[PDB]
Amino acid sequence: YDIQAWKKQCEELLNLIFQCEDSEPFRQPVDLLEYPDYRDIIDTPMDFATVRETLEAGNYESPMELCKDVRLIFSNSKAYTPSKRSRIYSMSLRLSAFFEEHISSVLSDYKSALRFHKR
Ligand SMILES: CCCCNC(=O)N1CCN(C(=O)c2ccco2)CC1
Question: What is said about its interaction partners and assembly?
Fold first, then answer.
């Protein structure tokens, strides 16, 4: 029932994600010079370095907020993909499945801890 345990759990999961080859395209913001129409399609850029920095700054209150930003990385890739068969989109779907498999217990444990706190 540790209300703070999510933060280190999220740091560890981000470490795993940075070790995954599938995260390569999502470790920094999209350079417009490679993809000059990116901001015509994507309203809110997001990447794993921005997520880690936000976490390490103490600017997430809950793992739900972190989860919303990570899911934005994946929705941006689905919105920007010219094909569902894209290399970089296919990497996003595998990384998304890995992230969802690992974040589920982090969320469950946090929400259980908060319910216990307010019991
Ligand atoms: C790590 C910094 C530079 C790598 N980032 C980058 O240029 N990417 C990632 C996001 N992109 C897509 O999700 C996508 C879908 C289909 C094609 O690209 C655009 C290309």
Answer: Interacts with IRS1 and IRS2. Interacts (via bromo domain) with acetylated lysine residues on histone H1.4, histone H3 and H4 (in vitro).
Which of 43, 60, 44 lies closest to 52, judged by CA?
60
Instruction: Domain count for the chain, please give it.
Output: 1
DSSP secondary structure string for all residues of 9-56 = HHHHHHHHHHHSGGGGGGSSPPPTTTSTTHHHH-SS---HHHHHHHHH
Which atom of ligand 1 is the closest one to the Cα of 38?
19
Could you tell me the resolution of this structure in angstroms? 1.2
Q: Write the single-letter amino acid at 13.
A: L
| Separation of CA 55 and ligand 1 centre (Å) | 22
| Residue numbers of the domain that contains 43 | 1-119
Q: Report the structure determination method.
A: X-ray
